[model samples]
Target: MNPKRIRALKSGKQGDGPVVYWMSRDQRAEDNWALLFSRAIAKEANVPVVVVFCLTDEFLEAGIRQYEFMLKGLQELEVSLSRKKIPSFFLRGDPGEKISRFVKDYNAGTLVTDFSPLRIKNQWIEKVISGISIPFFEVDAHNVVPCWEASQKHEYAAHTFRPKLYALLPEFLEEFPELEPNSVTPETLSDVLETGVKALLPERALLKNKDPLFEPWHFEPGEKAAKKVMESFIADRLDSYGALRNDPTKNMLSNLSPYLHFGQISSQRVVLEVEKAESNPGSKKAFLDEILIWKEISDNFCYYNPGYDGFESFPSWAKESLNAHRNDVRSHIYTLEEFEAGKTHDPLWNASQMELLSTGKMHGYTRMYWAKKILEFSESPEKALEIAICLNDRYELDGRDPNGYAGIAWSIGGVHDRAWGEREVTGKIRYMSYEGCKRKFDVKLYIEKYS
Candidate 1:
């Protein structure tokens, strides 16, 4: 199915200077609808297609992990677009206003961009609509089924939404059209920047001439690195992916969560790549389920529930249970400083937090256990939720995403899952104790290795 927004835009105002594409969500050269749509419009109009990115200073965290990852991906994107004679523009500011101003600056009559389900992305879209006179469009390149087409109301769980998504998947899973390079070259960066256009470097420190592989910026960036991450993952650990993906000690889990979070790699590309692999059917299914079932569930959650990130948006049971336990005394309450510094008495939680500190990522399953333990140790469920969400948004390279928010919510509040056994601290909020996690895997080794 064609993007719903572009299909609706056949009657909008058309012009001739350049067709602007605001790069935000799907930051990739291959299998990108926004870039392709802009090129098609530019080629048909006999004008240049300009792709611009706006950088922001405040990213919900003090560190630059997300920015670094995105910048690296953009650097590779810049090179790829250059080879195709497409000029990529880097601008810095609040993205929404910057996009509007750039449209006017380039005299763009038509604009197209990939869709983002996040509330922050919606804010930018609203600003762009109010600020620009030209016709603008959004493409649902992120979801297999367009969020609008999938459901009108928030779903209770995967089972509830799965049938709707399954019905639409076949139509959307078809091969994407190959984007042909335009021979028509656009304005050069020298001309664009010299005319006082905004320019932004990656959020990391620029150590001139330093090798990116060895130079740690708390996070890695770029498409080349993302591709390398996939390649290395398949080559080294395809066998372990099926069995060890959930085990903290095995460390066989794909480290691509941060890359995916930063938009260095598209979910479609990852799906296609894994489907092409001939060695392991089980592993392919396992990995694909992660994106299709779990990640897509996250998209469904955010798209349907606009109030997903806050406590007020949670289910009645979750809210009441949490409130019921609000006055319970925690085992040991520590400050945010103690949590960030890995001063917790729990070795597993401390180690997992340290892993995030050093490399900007933590094993996914460990992350759940870590967050749950915070709830167990904190004075109240509210404090537990606040501490986990704040720390997660701060340090994780994959932090501040819909998945991150949902992950924390599920760990603390049992957002999607039904309540299991009851306990004092968690009440009816689904329980996940450190001892239960220990029974499931070699939790001790993870603690020892990192601590």
Candidate 2:
């Protein structure tokens, strides 16, 4: 593991127990720097390695569909870690309280965890930091170029951010070290598992039998499943993505965001695999740009920008322009309740919402339109952001993530997007129309299928 990847959070004495990797954000057993780094520390100290996962039902906007996908992946990760002689514990409740207490009760020698840019995650880390006395570390194992290392400030646009990532790619993007199994006695394993019994995932009460998306969620969960999807995409979709990615009707999307969102796979790994694939240059670069630039900027946006999920995060020009049209009259208006039910005058917007409700996701292209329409139909930009974020966080498998937030902000508040010609209700914010969809894809067919 690269030494640059690890940052010390608290300087405290190591304990006699095994080194604990409080796993979050990055969940997979393989290709994980935090997990490997924890094991390295444990090996040097002649102690076994332990992995801890904290589960909570209180995650913002997450529902059964999101919970189920994540839990299934964690279950698989536990078994995979066991094979490497690391005992995995799954604890339920607030991560800060549960994980901090777990660290103390286990008498962990040292603590290390994966990185996330979200405010709630930072809060959890703060709680854990304040409570624990052991040396704690955070590894930017999720991003190819670590979030803080990407840039010192919030990025203005992809053009400015792109060059920075490309320049630093060689330094941060490299092969992951293989994790070696720890030499532990059978009795030691037994004691940890017995104690871990209390750390089980909360029961399936989060499951909803009536959820339209839950019953038919399209994406599979787990690291193996994520790899499989990547393989399928490389084998089939990579070549056509550049040409058809913008065309909503084509099956060109890699559909890896759900896997990416849950941290089942690393973006760095995705970039490596795609770069090695034998594919068309234009197509390969397009897909690469999406995963590399766009994805990286999402974390960059959230990590530095405090108001990532709201109007305040928008560029000043965007804020000023949007405020100018703050009270613009609307041809149609819909409440959060109406939008949640996918009740709208526009079939294109309704189809996108129905797709989200049915499959826990919408096409990237249509989603942009979906959000812009929300801005147009809602009484105010604040209400539009609220409704868009509610639906986004509530139903999308990839909801409540930096990418989701940044994307929503882009659509409704013009975060990274440039101002367009002034328009009704939208002001200088870019606009999307139902007629635009007709030109982009078979609008009626998309509406019919999702409807």
**lDDT (0 to 1) per candidate:** 0.72, 0.83
Candidate 1 has what TM-score?
0.88
Reference-based lDDT, residue 312, model 2: 85
Query: Model 1, 1-451: lDDT tens per residue?
Result: 3645253322356655788888887787877767777778777888878788776545434354454455556767888988888888887677767887898888897888777778888887788777777888777666566667776677777777777777877776666777777777754334433332222224232224542211255335667777887887778877669877888778587677877776677677777767777756688778877777678778777877777777766678878887887777777888877887788888778888877766677888888888888778787666777898787877677777778777877888787777767677677877766788888888778878775
TM-score, cand. 2: 0.93
226 Cα displacement, candidate 1 (Å): 1.5
User: Which parts of model 2 have CA positions greater than 4 angstroms off?
Assistant: 57-61, 185-213
Q: For model 2, what is the alpha-carbon lDDT of residue 224?
A: 97
What is the alpha-carbon lDDT of model 1 when measured against the actual structure? 0.72
Best by lDDT: 2
Query: Candidate 2's residue-wise lDDT over 1-451, tens digit each?
Result: 6787898889999898899998888889888888889989998998998988876646433565676687778778878988887888877678778988898788888999998889888888888888889999999887898888888888889999999989999898888878988886322323433334333323211225542344444788899999999999999999888888887766689999988888898878888899889898899889888898888899999988888987888898889998887877799999887887778888788888888877887999999999999989898888889988888988888887889889999999998889899986799998887787788888888888886
Q: Please give the RMSD of candidate 1 to the true structure.
A: 4.7
Off by over 4 Å in 1: 5-12, 187-220, 279-281
